[PDB]
Amino acid sequence: KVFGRCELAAAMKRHGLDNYRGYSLGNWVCAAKFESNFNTQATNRNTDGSTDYGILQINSRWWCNDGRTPGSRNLCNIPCSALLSSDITASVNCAKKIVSDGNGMNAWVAWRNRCKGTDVQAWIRGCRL
């Protein structure tokens, strides 16, 4: 599923992401835009053989099991394919665990490079929340 911007903002808000660990809704929408272009089916292979999955590009080395990342952990206790669903529930619940692990949203390289320190409220502007 390819979300609209306001559609994703509303779905993330309903799943508890607005101000989660102090990160306003605009940060999460900005991250999803540059991680996946709002596409729940996005995958990308990394150099170490891990793969990033879904609308927030969650990495198989630490967070989900894809059966092909040897010596990886599965800290969200899900198959990585669950992160590709049109229902973002699994991605959001895993994201909540990642952002809580000490490094905040710096875990997402696109957020660090393209959202951090910008006017992220622009990403939810005009949406009916």
Reduced to 3 states (helix: H, G, I; strand: E, B; else coil), residue 64 is coil
Which option in Cl ion, Na ion, none does residue 24 bind, with CB closer than 5 to 8 A by kind?
Cl ion
Q: How far is the CB of 17 from Cl ion (least distance, A)?
A: 11
Q: How far is the CB of 20 from Na ion (least distance, A)?
A: 23
Binding site for Na ion (CB under 5 A): 60, 65, 69, 72, 74
66 is in an annotated binding site: no
Q: How far is the CB of 126 from Na ion (least distance, A)?
A: 38
Residues in the chain: 129
CA angle 52, 7, 84 (to 5 degrees): 25
**Distance between CA atoms of residues 28 and 95, nearest Å:** 10
**Closer of 17 and 78 to Cl ion (Cβ):** 17
**Distance between CA atoms of residues 93 and 95, nearest Å:** 5
Catalytic residue among 35, 48, 87, 119: 35
Given a contact cutoff of 8 angstroms between Cβ atoms, the answer to whether 58 and 38 are in contact is: no
Residue ranges in 45-104 that form contacts with Cl ion under rule CB under 5 A: 104
Under the binding rule (CB under 5 A), the answer on residue 24 touching Cl ion is: yes
Tell me which residue of 20, 22, 54 sits closest to 35, measured CA to CA.
54
Catalytic (active-site) positions = 35, 52
